[PDB]
Amino acid sequence: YFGTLTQKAPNWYRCSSTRAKEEVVGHVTLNKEHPDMTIECVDDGGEFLPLEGARSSYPRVCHIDAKDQDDCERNRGFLTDYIPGAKQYWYKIEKVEQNGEQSVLYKFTVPWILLPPAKQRYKVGCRYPNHEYCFVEVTVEPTPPMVEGKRVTCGYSESGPVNLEVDLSKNANFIEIRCGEQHHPQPSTYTLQYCSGDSVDPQKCSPQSLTNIFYDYSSSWWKGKLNGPDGATLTIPPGGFPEEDKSFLVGCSLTVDGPPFCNVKVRVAGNPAAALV
Fold this sequence. Notes:
The protein contains one helix and 22 strands. It is mainly β. The protein has two domains: 1-143, no CATH class; 144-277, no CATH class. A five-stranded mixed beta sheet has the order 1-2-4-9-8, with no helix packed on it. A hairpin with a 2-residue loop joins β12 (146-148) and β13 (151-153). It comes from Toxoplasma gondii (strain ATCC 50611 / Me49).
């Protein structure tokens, strides 16, 4: 049931219902420099795979291991499970007529600031009523981990933990940490505990009380969830700062318990600063 897939440009593929003898699969990579892709389905008398997936208010995609059109569609996933915040209007759809050939063009663009914190793979393509199909696999590259001011955006890599450091002090007393809606906090008890070990890996975390770090500590100093849409914000009242410089580890895991990990070392400045003793 293989349709015939040809590449017209990087991230632009064309499928027709001409029966090919071997399965050819397209390969798209979406990142900041190449935030868009085009799927072109030839109408031989031209639907995006999965059917309706580029028109619906909840956009839908194939699992990356779908074996064919029916396997894809009977198991169709949600685009937002791969890219949080994805919207139908990230697709622009066009009918094109050329020299007696009708095709439909589905051009998908990810706003680059919304690239996910971990690499994702799904696939889409073209499908026909007689069950013919072409797959185009989509790799969505991640937003780099970063610390911008006091906002810490975690990220995940299979080639090792991500380590980020950020500062807290009396006069710059809040930080925001984002694990992403797809991921998970470490330790899970982070509003009460930090990792005294050298990783937020549950096997290495060695959770200890945040009363080791702050004075008059309260879990109420955290607002928002680490895996909520805006991450979690930790705000330290001025009296909360100890006399000594300190640090603690909090972070994120890809899955509830498992790697990759993102380790955020929060460096707490002692109060008073030496100038003001």
